Amino acid sequence: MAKTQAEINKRLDAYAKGTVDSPYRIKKATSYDPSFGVMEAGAIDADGYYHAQCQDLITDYVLWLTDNKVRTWGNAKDQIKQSYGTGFKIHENKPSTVPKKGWIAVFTSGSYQQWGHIGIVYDGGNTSTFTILEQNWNGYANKKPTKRVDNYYGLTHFIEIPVK
Ligand SMILES: [Ca+2]
């Protein structure tokens, strides 16, 4: 059920614009847990807990990449400890490793949360920096998927996805 790069690129744009086709996309500003921020329209809350966390975007993504056949478990650091199916490949991030658009970036070291941070490679970039689309880098779980330029700090693994 592999997706085309064009379908992937279009999915990544819809996330960032808050118009993604998902049943987990927040349509109007919402809150149910006062410990977090009011979730804006565009935010992805896949489990319905702790608002728009980092992993929520990835479980919605993996869900779409596989036509709702693979649901993710655990947190960000748990994602390299399970399988998404055929076509998906886990790569270690080393200084020469540059990812591709649509790939999943996993942060399990540095001063990151012990349960990790996660996001989608929006632009592969180069050896020094790349662009990520992620949720909950602010720790407040309210913003929709936002682009950030990352410098491979704390980034330990990439997950390659199947492309047509
Ligand atoms: Ca959630």
Residue numbers in the entry: 1 to 164
The publication says:
The staphylococcal phage lysin LysGH15 demonstrates great potential against methicillin-resistant Staphylococcus aureus (MRSA). LysGH15 shares very high sequence identity with other lysins of class III staphylococcal phages, such as LysK, phi11, and MV-L. Moreover, these lysins possess a modular structure containing an N-terminal CHAP domain (cysteine, histidine-dependent amidohydrolases/peptidases), a central amidase-2 domain (N-acetylmuramoyl-L-alanine amidase), and a C-terminal SH3b domain (the SH3 bacterial binding domain, which typically contains 60–70 residues and is homologous to eukaryotic SH3 proteins). To elucidate the molecular mechanism, we determined the structures of three individual LysGH15 domains using X-ray crystallography or nuclear magnetic resonance (NMR).
The CHAP domain crystallizes in the P6222 space group with two molecules in the asymmetric unit (ASU). However, a Bis-Tris-propane molecule does not mediate homodimer formation of the CHAP domain in solution and cannot affect the activity of the CHAP domain. The crystal structure of the CHAP domain unexpectedly reveals a calcium-binding site near the Cys-His-Glu-Asn quartet active site (the active site that consists of cysteine, histidine, glutamic acid, and asparagine typically found in members of the CHAP family), and site-directed mutagenesis further confirms that both the calcium ion binding site and the conserved Cys-His-Glu-Asn quartet are required for the lytic activity of the LysGH15 CHAP domain. In the center of the groove, C54, H117, E134, and N136 form the Cys-His-Glu-Asn quartet. However, in light of its location near the active site groove and its significant influence on the lytic activity of the protein, there are two potential functions for this calcium ion: (i) it participates in the catalytic activity as part of the reaction; or (ii) it positions the key residues, particularly C54, to form the appropriate conformation.
